[PDB]
C-alpha cells in the first residue's frame, strides 16, 4: 500500500486497521477449568 499525505512539521504515525476476524471460542469442560481457543485471520495468531 502506498499512501500520499499532506506534509506536517512533526513526526507523525500511520494507523492502518487491517480488519481481521479476531475470534475467541471459550470451552469450559470441567468445573473450574476454562480453556479458550483463539483465532484471527489474515494476521494469523492463536490456538487454531
Amino acid at each position: 500500500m502506498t499512501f500520499e499525505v499532506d506534509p506536517m512539521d512533526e513526526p507523525t504515525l500511520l494507523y492502518v486497521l487491517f480488519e481481521v476476524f479476531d475470534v475467541v471460542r471459550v470451552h469450559r469442560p470441567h468445573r473450574g477449568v476454562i480453556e479458550t481457543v483463539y483465532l484471527r485471520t489474515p494476521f494469523s495468531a492463536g490456538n487454531a
Partner: protein
C-alpha cells in the same frame, strides 16, 4: 503503526507475504508520534504528553 517523517509526503508501506483468507478491509488515520504512547510496556519514558 507506521512511522512518517517530518514534512514527508509519500508513505509506502509493505505487508510482506501473508495468507489473506477472510480479509475484511482497511481503515486508516494519520496519528502523531507525540500523542501516541508506545503500548506494550509497563512505562513509556519517551512519552511527555497527557
Amino acid at each position: 503503526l507506521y512511522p512518517i517523517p517530518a514534512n514527508a509526503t509519500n508513505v509506502p508501506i509493505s505487508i510482506p507475504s501473508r495468507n489473506w483468507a477472510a480479509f475484511r478491509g482497511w481503515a486508516f488515520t494519520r496519528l502523531k508520534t507525540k500523542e501516541t504512547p508506545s503500548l506494550g510496556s509497563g512505562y513509556d519514558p519517551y512519552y511527555t504528553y497527557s
